[PDB]
């Protein structure tokens, strides 16, 4: 079976001598050593979470699948059964009238975003984002982003979970598992500096509601330092995730899970920091491998010529990871990444201002640059994730509306 996705992989089923079937995904022309190393990092994270009492009392574990490279151009990836893409679930939840209008219709948010980029910047390419960054105001961006958010149904995840479940108990269990898995994934991805979290990089377990993260191409600020359109977001906490907990707020279960996981991670960081140090200084992780990977896939269209140029320094990535594993402001870290990568740009000041805040509506701009507690760090992370100023200037493929 050919999978309808990027690079068009294929699914094969292997019959073992144990009288069982083992589905696998065959990927050709794609190095997968980075994925294997990231899975090993997640296994180390799982062990650290398992040895902590507060997280063990809630069973906080990241779901890890198997990645095996057999050649520097071919490998095998374990196939998860009874799982679906988050984007696919959101699209299938919508009715025919809703789907056609978002999918194929003028004035739709996928088209309104491009129309707004054309309006605030006389360009039809990647430079429109740069011109909008230099030539737009916070009020206009916030109002336009809210008006664009208002055009997408506000209870897609809730309606989907209602439709799958048969009893209120099943709905409660599915929603709780989804929220806990997403919070753990968000905090673990922020610690590892993983970006490019669009709706096709999340897989939902349709039987239990769990969430799985896939397709780890960027690591340690690669989406904030090397992309033509930078990603100033720690993780994906969009309108649908907030609306899933309809009567309550994000300062409850998700906040508690993130705080507990961050407290577990920050205690004795030696094992984690050493493992990511061994990860970051590798002879097979040269800039050539990164540019080949980013060239093969579309992403933000990094192009054959890179404006940010080669600034690959493994010492800075591990230093930033160690800094954020201590008390540090996420806004400071992303501004440092922007300074490292986007120094020779005409919108550097606007990048820094948008990523830092305004000190009137953001809690992360009223805090010091270091020495933050776990609760304050998680609060700043949520504030930076849910900021309409940052979310209204993102890449079109990220889809900040959903």
């Amino acid at each position: 079976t050919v999978m309808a996705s990027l690079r068009r992989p294929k699914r094969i089923i292997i019959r073992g001598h144990d009288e069982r079937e083992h589905p696998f995904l065959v990927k050709g022309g794609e190095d997968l050593r980075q994925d294997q190393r990231v899975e090993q990092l997640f296994q180390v994270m799982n062990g650290i979470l398992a040895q902590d009492s507060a997280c063990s009392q809630r069973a906080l574990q990241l779901r890890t699948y198997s990645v095996v490279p057999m050649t520097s151009r071919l490998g095998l990836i374990e196939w998860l059964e009874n799982t679906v893409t988050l984007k696919d679930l959101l699209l299938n939840t919508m009715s025919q009238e809703e789907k056609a209008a978002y999918l194929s219709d003028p004035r739709a948010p996928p088209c309104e975003y491009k129309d707004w980029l054309t309006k605030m910047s006389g360009k039809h390419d990647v430079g429109a984002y740069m011109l909008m960054y230099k030539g737009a105001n916070r009020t206009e961006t916030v109002t336009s982003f809210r008006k664009r958010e208002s055009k997408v149904p506000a209870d897609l995840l809730k309606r989907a979970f209602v439709r799958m479940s048969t009893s209120p108990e099943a709905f409660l269990a599915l929603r709780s598992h989804f929220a806990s898995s997403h919070a753990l994934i968000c905090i673990s991805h922020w610690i590892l500096g993983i970006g490019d979290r669009h709706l096709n990089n999340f897989m939902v377990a349709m039987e239990t509601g769990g969430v799985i993260g896939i397709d780890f191409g960027h690591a340690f600020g690669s989406a904030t330092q090397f992309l033509p359109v930078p990603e100033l977001m720690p993780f994906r906490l969009t309108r649908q995730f907030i609306n899933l907990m309809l009567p309550m707020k994000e300062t409850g279960l998700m906040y508690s899970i993130m705080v507990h996981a961050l407290r577990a991670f920050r205690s004795d960081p030696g094992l984690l920091t050493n493992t990511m140090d061994v990860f970051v200084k590798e002879p097979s992780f040269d800039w050539k491998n990164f540019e080949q990977k980013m060239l093969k896939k579309g992403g933000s269209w990094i192009q054959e010529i890179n404006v940010a140029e080669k600034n690959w320094y493994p010492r800075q990535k591990i230093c930033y990871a160690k800094r954020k594993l201590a008390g540090a402001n996420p806004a400071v870290i992303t501004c440092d990444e922007l300074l490292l990568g986007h120094e020779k740009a005409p919108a550097f000041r606007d990048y820094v201002a948008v990523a830092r805040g305004s000190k009137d509506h953001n809690i992360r701009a009223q805090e010091p640059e270091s020495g933050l507690s776990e609760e304050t760090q998680v609060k700043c992370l949520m504030d930076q994730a849910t900021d309409p100023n940052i979310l209204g200037r993102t890449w079109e493929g990220w889809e900040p509306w959903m």
């Binding site: 019959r15 069982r20 799958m164 048969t166 099943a170 269990a173």
Partner: protein, 464 residues
């Protein structure tokens, strides 16, 4: 494929004599403290094991062996043979030979008991769970599934529950904790299944009391494994909707208005009651209502929709319903059997018709039959699925025209190719299902002369 099927004793009087002898030995043999049974353990066990090996379908040998092993434990016969071949015979070679013979017979019985059922299974489980703790301490895993089956059947058959409880207590008390620790997550879920029935021969109240005491005595570091199976895999299942949309719209008639209700919200509980209900009246009512809803589903699917939209797709619903119908058509009951076997035959005849063909509904029916024929637990369902495959081919080759077969799914060629794939599958039950299927088709296969001259050498090579 069931071994103890369509088989009768040559001399019915000898079986009655053996049953009377076993029942008499239950009362007489364990008497007198077994002081006098000391020199007869080996002489009894060897002959009983030889006769049981020669005749593996008689439970009386297993019962007699059960009395034999029980009397030995009061004697203590197997308290010093655990080293086995480390020392040849420090005290007595008879005890060592008896130990070795007992070890091998139990492992074979555990391996062979997976196809038995009813009385023969209850006797095999009792015999294996009455074994001394040293033999279980050798390999725990081969005896685990015996404990699980004994507990599951003891949810409805008290003596098996008592035997399993005693075996679990002995294993937890005498076997070392380090070796028994990994298996508790496999054992405790069925005790949880026992405990869940507390809302509704030793009566079940004392069985639940003993289960509670066993759970408490295990300790907090172990009894948490009581929740290992739950909240994972199947336990989440059957809690999800069969279809994300609603297909069966029913307009209840009244003299004033016609309110609309949906009958697909009743389907899971109705099928569950029709399959497994203790009371007979609710089972009959559920079976009748399921028959009515199957008729309603067929009529709604075949009805030309009044609206501009197409026919309502019943693929998801048919796929959940068709496996249940196959199970119901081969029930231990006879009202259910004569109610549902003609239903399955009629469904095959309808889905093999000229009108309803080359569709996903026939595909769903065929894959349901072919999945049932590879059931690794139920053999009656396997037989019935073989008979369904015969009927399917017989009505597929007749109803269709000689034309309208090129590039058409659900054909003779396609059915053979699925059987050929099943036959080459490394799993043991897939090959068994393919062989049973061919054994049910060959009468219809040999009649078509044109079909034979192209389907004999390939089938011969495939089955060899």
């Amino acid at each position: 494929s069931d071994p103890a099927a369509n088989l009768h004793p040559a001399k019915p009087k000898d079986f009655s004599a053996f049953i009377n002898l076993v029942e008499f030995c239950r009362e007489i043999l364990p008497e007198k403290q077994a002081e006098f049974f000391e020199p007869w353990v080996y002489s009894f066990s060897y002959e009983l094991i030889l006769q049981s090996t020669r005749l593996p379908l008689i439970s009386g040998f297993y019962k007699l062996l059960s009395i034999t092993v029980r009397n030995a434990k009061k004697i203590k016969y197997f308290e010093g043979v655990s080293p086995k071949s480390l020392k040849h015979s420090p005290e007595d070679p008879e005890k060592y030979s008896c130990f070795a013979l007992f070890v091998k017979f139990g492992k074979e019985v555990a391996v062979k008991m997976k196809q038995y059922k009813d009385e023969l299974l209850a006797s095999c489980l009792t015999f294996l769970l009455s074994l001394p703790h040293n033999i279980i301490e050798l390999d725990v895993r081969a005896y685990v599934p015996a404990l699980q089956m004994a507990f599951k059947l003891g949810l409805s058959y008290t003596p098996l529950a008592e035997v399993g409880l005693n075996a679990l207590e002995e294993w937890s008390i005498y076997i070392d904790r380090h070796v028994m620790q990994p298996y508790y997550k496999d054992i405790l879920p069925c005790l949880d299944g026992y405990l869940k029935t507390s809302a509704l021969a030793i009566s079940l109240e004392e069985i639940r009391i003993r289960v509670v005491q066993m759970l408490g005595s295990l300790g907090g570091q172990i009894n948490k494994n009581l929740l290992t199976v739950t909240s994972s895999d199947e336990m989440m299942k059957s809690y999800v909707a069969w279809d994300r949309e609603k297909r069966l719209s029913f307009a209840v008639p009244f003299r004033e208005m016609k309110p609309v209700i949906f009958l697909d919200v009743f389907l899971p509980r109705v099928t569950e009651l029709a399959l497994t209900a203790s009371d007979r009246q609710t089972k009959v009512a559920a079976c009748e209502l399921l028959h009515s809803m199957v008729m309603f589903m067929l009529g709604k699917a075949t009805q030309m929709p009044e609206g501009g939209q197409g026919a309502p797709p019943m693929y998801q619903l048919y796929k959940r319903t068709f496996p249940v119908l196959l199970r119901l058509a081969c029930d231990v009951d006879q009202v259910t059997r004569q109610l549902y076997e003609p239903l399955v035959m009629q469904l095959i005849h309808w889905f093999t018709n000229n009108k309803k063909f080359e569709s996903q509904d026939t595909v769903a029916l065929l894959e349901a039959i072919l999945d049932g024929i590879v059931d690794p637990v139920d053999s009656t369902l396997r037989d019935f699925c073989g008979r369904c495959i015969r009927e399917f081919l017989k009505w597929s080759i007749k109803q269709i025209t000689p034309q309208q077969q090129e590039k058409s799914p659900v054909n003779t060629k396609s059915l053979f190719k699925r059987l050929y794939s099943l036959a080459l599958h490394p799993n043991a039950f897939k090959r068994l299902g393919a062989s049973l299927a061919f054994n049910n088709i060959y009468r219809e296969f040999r009649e078509e002369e044109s079909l034979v001259e192209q389907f004999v050498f390939e089938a011969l090579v495939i089955y060899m």
